[PDB]
């Protein structure tokens, strides 16, 4: 059942059952994050380069090429066999994509999304991916950002919209700040 | 389009793995002490299956009883809610059958899904039992088994010397 | 009264982190919060002396445990993390102040501070759970700092 | 100001009086639990007085400190096994847990006039005592702050059968 | 190095950087409990038959008989290469033996050691190697009890030792339990 | 015969590391890293190290320094007295040297005993704690047959030869 097969730039990963691409300019480190996010416990699935497919008018499935199947490149170190190294409930064969975080470099030109209200969005043959845009500033702790993204994404799904519910309290909140006195 | 199955349907490291067989005050209890692990509960004790791919069974979360395990002795839990929303989760994909109390299938729509039962004795931490079990399935879909290593073993034996 | 930074149960010691700008307070509490740690509130929170001793902090009637990560936009950490991760209110007991001995006055009361340069890809996380760790510690008997010094005093007395 | 028997922990900050029969084996849950992130206050022997009308709190008597017994291992010192997360020196107890070797509505429990929440669970053979009093304990908080779930779920089956 | 080569039946697991050898019965679960430890950090040097040899007079090295590497028997569903589940971090080829954990069926015939006082030991090649023996009660947490054998072994090794620290104060706490009335 | 070094002696997983090279950073906040990510200090700042028999040297604590850490901020912690018995070690083999520069599979002498080394090139971002969990990892991997290169060769043939 083998459809087209295109090719993208960044990190796929599982976390908590969720497939996240990690995409970004190098200088962020989207591997060093990969690994922080297997110590973790979520799933490896591409570095650097990864397979996506469609399969769904709504769904995106990615995965590695073959050839580069559990590996994983440390500018620096050299290159590893995640699977060898941190097991096999470390790394899995695909997942579909609910989610791109793109990784972008903090420069105060433009702005970012403060109420979670925004709804950005990258086509992928077809599919309009979810999309979302973290600043990078050296020593962020990433691995959290990305596990938070996921998290909230599920939670926004299932109808938990934290954005909503402060959009509603929002009168009552001023009301008890200004009450500053 | 729909079904029922009686069960635990968990994420466990990405793979899909239902649970069947009661007793123990198992799965309820058990689905638990998979969530303070890290795993992710589907749906407790009810599950709709339906079919995806020509070897693809998709298990869902009921729209109601969504995310509730009951434990006897404070009630109902809402798993969401005691434990955030990378303890839940919706979907999987089923690929894996662990029946409580060799290898085998079960099939359900045509779909003949790997089963596995295991032989159970009242003390047993059937967490760590399960948590292996889906390890194991992932790595054996990838080449790797205890006989493959075990001749590595042989040889190194029969020649290093 | 009521106060800005961010008020932390961390092993159960309620610590106020009131770090500076940019370097994200919240991003901390995110990290604190996944490492078993709990919220009690981030921003404008509620203290109000109970003994000449000992101080409260609170979480406000609305918008609880509710926290802004810049990009993801508004997160609810009780449903993210779930209840382990939230709390009412605490005792606070120790103020870490950020940067980039000491104390602090709230309503009158003395409370015990610290303060921390971090640096260029320095983990506040753990070096705020260690401060806590070690106030403890310290104040359970156990100094080490003056457990050196005397170790290091009678190691310079020895000589031959 | 009088003195109790059973385990006192903070677990995520609520504090719980484990009380339980013998053989049920109070200590070594105390131990799992401290493995687990939460502390120990006073295993036997805590001291509980009162605060305010609402509020019992519970320390550690002056000596005991942080001491326990295992079976088999003996003395061994909290603090000492597991660093300084793994003690506290007081917490208010919220809730008291009583363990149950007897197999056969909602109930409170009596400390210097205080009702005190109380929830009883039946020690089944081989279930895993840590995992269902942290959950009792976060529970027990999502209650207080008004996500009942039992209250939930049953209003959800009303308007099911309802629904016809 | 090429010396002689006992056999012992147990579980040599590496608990913290300690070396531990866990003996008992079928029916006490050494190789679930090994694998409860793997989960937690451990490390797995030998399943079911150990390896031993003397290196100095107090000290023994433990390992796996090459032929069963990295292998280990779960009655439930068969044999599994842990390396293969649990990645490099949770194997290892050898430890020394600083503690023997020998579980023991709850009898009511002996009375078991209530303070850390006693000092029992099992004789290896020459070396009277530490050891400590815990009852089984099926569903106790035997993987909690071992780090908790190790982490108090390796206190007492340190100076630190709560059954000195419980006798000197014996009598003040005796003092204030009276001071109840 | 003792000699004596700069830099902090760990054990990851088992393996004996020793970190040299301060990254003004402060390699005993790596060491900190390390021990609340579960791993051992035998020794922060300097490490009394000796011979043992060719290939093999051990790494031991001072009878005095001793599991001790100076963080600036806070000052002089004690890791047996935060963390546990857990946390500390009094020695162990060192097989790898990871230095900290602020193919190679480099070597280096320590009484005549070539030491496995490997120099990273650090830039102020930089997870060390993980890069010097996975070093510890691969070198266990790289010592049992396991490379990468073999991976790669593996996944090489399967797509030149389509399936196994």
Request: aromatic content about 6%; charged content about 25%; hydrophobic content about 40%.
């Amino acid at each position: 059942q083998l459809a087209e097969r295109r090719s993208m730039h960044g990190v796929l990963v599982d976390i908590y059952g969720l497939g996240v691409l990690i995409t970004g300019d190098s200088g962020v480190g989207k591997s060093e994050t990969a690994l922080e996010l297997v110590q973790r416990g979520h799933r490896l699935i591409a570095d650097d380069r990864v397979d996506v497919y469609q399969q769904d008018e709504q769904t995106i499935v990615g995965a590695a090429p073959p050839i580069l199947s559990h590996l994983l490149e440390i500018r620096g170190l050299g290159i590893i066999d995640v699977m060898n190294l941190f097991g096999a409930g470390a790394v899995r064969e695909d997942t579909t994509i609910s989610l791109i975080v793109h990784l972008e470099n903090w420069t105060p030109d433009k702005t970012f999304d403060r109420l979670g209200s925004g709804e950005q969005t990258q086509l992928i043959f077809d599919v309009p991916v979810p999309k979302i845009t973290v600043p990078f500033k050296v020593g962020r702790n990433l691995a959290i950002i990305i596990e938070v993204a996921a998290m909230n994404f599920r939670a926004k799904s299932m109808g938990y919209d934290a954005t909503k519910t402060f959009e509603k309290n929002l009168n009552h909140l001023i009301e008890h700040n200004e009450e500053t006195d």
